[PDB]
Amino acid sequence: WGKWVRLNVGGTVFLTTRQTLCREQKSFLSRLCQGEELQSDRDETGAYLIDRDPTYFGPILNFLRHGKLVLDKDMAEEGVLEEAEFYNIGPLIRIIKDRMEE
């Protein structure tokens, strides 16, 4: 093993590090790459399998990188929210919600 981790999210593979995923100790991702997830399934390439849409995963992963929420203009904020709720990142869910009143 190493510091690098591959996540197969709905058929698309994302490359990142343990440091990035484990910024939120109670998140699904930190729990995943620490082997504390019961359903830890991996393909032959060693990538973690996630039955979620990869379209809205980029922003989630970027928040874990630089702490900010950045969206392109055409991307639905509702889609990112559903993912943030699934991966259980509190701070991000809040920021998204706070962005959806005005």
Author numbering: 29 to 130
Which statements did the authors publish about this structure?
The human KCTD family contains 25 soluble proteins that share a conserved potassium (K+) Channel Tetramerization Domain (a subtype of ‘BTB domain’) at their N-termini and have variable C-termini. The BTB fold of the Kv and KCTD families has a roughly pyramidal wedge shape and consists of five α-helices and a single β-sheet made from three β-strands. Here, we present novel X-ray crystal structures of the BTB domains of a further five members of the KCTD family and examine the stoichiometry and stability of their multimeric assemblies in solution.
KCTD17 regulates ciliogenesis by polyubiquitylating trichoplein and its missense mutation is associated with autosomal-dominant myoclonus-dystonia. For instance, the closed pentameric assembly previously observed for KCTD5 was also found in the KCTD17 structure. We also observed higher-order packing in the crystal lattice of the His6-KCTD17 structure resulting in dodecamerization of the core pentameric ring. This assembly establishes an extraordinary T = 1 icosahedral protein shell comprising 60 monomers that enclose a large water-filled cavity. Overall, the BTB domains displayed a range of affinities from low-to-high nanomolar: KCTD17 (Kd = 7 nM) > KCTD5 (Kd = 55 nM) > SHKBP1 (Kd = 87 nM) > KCTD13 (Kd = 100 nM), KCTD10 (Kd = 460 nM). As expected, the complex of KCTD17 and Cul3 was found to run on SEC with a radius of hydration consistent with the formation of a 5 : 5 KCTD to Cul3 heterodecameric assembly. Analysis of the SAXS data revealed that the scattering curve fit well to that of a structural model built by superposition of each KCTD17 BTB subunit with a homologous BTB domain from the structure of the KLHL11-Cul3 complex. This model placed the Cul3 subunits at the interface between two BTB subunits increasing the overall interaction surface. Homology modelling based on the conservation between KCTD17 and the KLHL11-Cul3 structure suggests that the close proximity of a neighbouring BTB domain in the KCTD17 pentamer can provide an additional Cul3-binding interface that may substitute for the lack of a 3-box.
